[PDB]
């Protein structure tokens, strides 16, 4: 019984009973407890018998485990429902999350931790509400399962019940003295989640229970949240309160009539003009008290359209689906603000549609505006630069010449984003270093793709000077990946993952043009990575020096003429021609290197050690370390 947990875990995985009954055979206290309580690792979970006995919905295994002996119901464990590996998940928690009433009835009957917290303070009742079953929720509440207990971010079980689409448990929770007006760390009142998801009935019984209306942390009223996600059904209910005033009525109407046009799922031009007309008509027919919208400067991204503030002007837009999208973008930015989280996505989607229609000229404009909005919000723009690289590669691939100001702007935003990513990496603990460093490497790769696109685009002298300055700034910032590769080591490495969407079409690392641009921008031609491989140790290890020779000769003749040391030594004591995977790449190196008695004497000093701290010039003290 030393480690025979495989039998019990496999039997409980499918809920086998006779296998467990044969497993238990006339045990006294010591070995019976050592069997029943024997947890194991099974990486990713905690592998207790009574975690998979409840996750798979098998009350018989828990029944034999809890009938004549009381196994540890309060067993700390981690269980996964997709990417939801949450610690502290006892049998009650995982059972409620999966949604099995039988095993829950076989846990609380003996007395279980109905309010068992976790790292996220997710009560078992919250997991049941996420599942949505009414039977488990009322069973927990009737056993005093701490309805008021929230998560870390104050996300009480009512809010997750009102977001995942479970009207029954919402009605029951409101019927059992819950908190309709419960807030959150950022502000997520119970109307916000239901309005965002768009459930009509949940908002119906919330406003029937006087859930009240309070503004979100992002300056969002529940009606504005409802209108933001294009849910026109819930807005009509919230507009019936007759306490929002016409300032919010004509705000929400414009907001959703703008959201419908520039949205992915429920994109409807017919359901856009109707709501925009219903919006403006409220303020353009009242008498001598008509309301005119606040002025908005003509944004260059949206075709220099100053929006429409007339019934005749709006009527002129119900003939041009190309103009209603821009008008929706303008109205959404005017109402949602320039700092909201979700104001960026419609702009990116409209630019993506323009790109899919091969109209990249307006796609670049819209996405540049979206990138500026995202970067002036301290947001994570580690994918927008990738989408720019994909658009630029698709433009270069077909026949199209990208504008040089576009590459200048995207490169400037890229160096700003990479500096920001370095700041986040340096200013964070190991809780999220993995994802932050992955985003940092992604940002570096996107900058490299943008540089490769810039090399393959002819532009005037001023444009090239601007692009070279933008590259030079990041070169002097000295960025390095997790394995020590600088911004030049990746431009010569063939193992750098080029994105497969469209940058795979035209971006081929290693590049001669990219490495020449980097070396002409002040790149450390003689730097080393974490192991010690310099910019020359990496290119020499090339797969194809018989077909891609032109960018292997023009990346060795350019490295060694920029000051790269052909006799350098990495950690494993290997010169670049000692680290040659081919012959055509060491012949070129042996042609592009010269015998210097400085290198020979440095090798002699490094071999027969001399204690070269003093009695040597300061600059040669690193030269000896090179070899």
């Amino acid at each position: 019984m030393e480690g025979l947990a495989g039998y019990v875990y496999k039997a409980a995985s499918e809920g086998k009973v006779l296998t467990l009954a044969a497993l238990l055979l006339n045990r006294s206290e010591s070995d019976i407890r050592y069997l029943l309580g024997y947890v194991s690792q099974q990486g990713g979970q905690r592998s207790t018998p009574l975690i998979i006995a409840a996750r798979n919905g098998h009350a018989k295994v828990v029944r034999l485990l809890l009938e004549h002996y009381r196994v540890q119901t309060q067993q700390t464990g981690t269980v996964r429902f997709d990417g939801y590996v949450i610690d502290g998940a006892t049998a009650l928690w995982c059972a409620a999350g999966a949604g099995h009433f039988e095993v829950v009835k076989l846990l609380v009957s003996h007395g279980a931790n109905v309010n068992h917290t976790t790292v996220t303070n997710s009560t078992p009742l919250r997991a049941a509400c996420f599942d949505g079953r009414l039977d488990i929720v009322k069973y927990l509440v009737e056993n005093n399962a701490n309805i008021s207990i929230a998560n870390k971010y104050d996300n009480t079980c009512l809010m997750i019940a009102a977001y995942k689409g479970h009207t029954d448990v919402v009605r029951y929770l409101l019927e059992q003295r819950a908190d309709p007006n419960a807030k959150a760390h950022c502000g997520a009142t119970a109307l916000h989640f239901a309005a965002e998801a768009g459930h009509i009935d949940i908002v119906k019984e919330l406003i029937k229970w006087r859930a009240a209306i309070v503004v979100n942390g992002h300056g969002m009223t529940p009606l504005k949240v409802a209108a933001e996600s294009c849910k026109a059904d819930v807005v009509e209910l919230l507009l019936s309160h007759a306490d929002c005033d016409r300032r919010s009525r004509i705000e929400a109407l414009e907001l959703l009539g703008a959201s419908f046009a520039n949205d992915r799922e429920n994109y409807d031009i017919i359901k856009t003009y109707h709501y925009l007309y219903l919006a403006m008509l409220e303020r353009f027919q009242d008498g001598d008290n008509i309301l005119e919208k606040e002025v908005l400067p003509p944004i260059h991204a949206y075709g220099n359209r100053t929006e429409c503030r007339n019934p005749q002007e709006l009527e002129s837009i119900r003939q041009d689906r190309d103009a209603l999208h821009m008008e929706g973008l303008i109205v959404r930015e005017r109402i949602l603000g320039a700092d909201n989280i979700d104001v960026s996505h419609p702009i990116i989607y409209r630019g993506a549609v323009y790109a899919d229609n091969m109209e990249f000229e307006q796609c670049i404009k819209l996405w540049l505006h979206a990138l500026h909005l995202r970067q002036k919000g301290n947001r994570n723009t580690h994918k927008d630069l990738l989408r720019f690289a994909q658009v630029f590669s698709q433009m270069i691939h077909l026949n199209e010449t990208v504008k040089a100001p576009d590459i200048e702007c995207v490169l400037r935003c890229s160096v700003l984003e990479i500096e920001q990513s370095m700041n986040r990496v340096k200013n964070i603990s190991d809780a999220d270093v993995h994802n932050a460093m992955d985003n940092y490497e992604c940002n570096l790769y996107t900058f490299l793709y943008l540089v490769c696109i810039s090399t393959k685009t002819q532009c005037s002298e001023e444009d090239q000077c601007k692009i070279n300055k933008q590259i030079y700034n990041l070169i002097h910032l000295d960025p390095r990946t997790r394995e020590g590769f600088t911004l030049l080591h990746l431009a010569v490495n063939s193992n750098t993952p080029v994105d497969d969407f469209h940058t795979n079409d035209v971006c081929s690392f290693p590049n001669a043009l990219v490495t020449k641009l980097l070396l002409d921008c002040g790149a450390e031609v003689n730097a080393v990575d974490n192991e010690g491989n310099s910019a020359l140790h990496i290119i020499v290890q090339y797969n194809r020096p018989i077909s891609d020779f032109l960018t292997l000769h023009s990346i060795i003749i350019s490295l060694v003429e920029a000051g790269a040391h052909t006799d350098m030594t990495n950690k494993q004591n290997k010169t670049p021609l000692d680290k040659s995977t081919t012959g055509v790449s060491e012949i070129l190196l042996k042609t592009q290197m010269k015998m210097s008695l400085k290198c020979l004497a440095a090798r002699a000093v490094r071999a027969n050690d001399i204690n070269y701290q003093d009695q040597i010039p300061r600059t040669l003290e690193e030269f000896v370390g090179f070899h």
Binding site: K152, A188, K383, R387, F501
Partner: peptide, 17 residues
């Protein structure tokens, strides 16, 4: 399609279980 790649942006632990 570029618009198809936008469906992946529709991560926060607030609304998790």
């Amino acid at each position: 399609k570029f618009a198809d790649h936008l469906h992946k942006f529709h991560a926060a632990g607030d609304l998790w279980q």
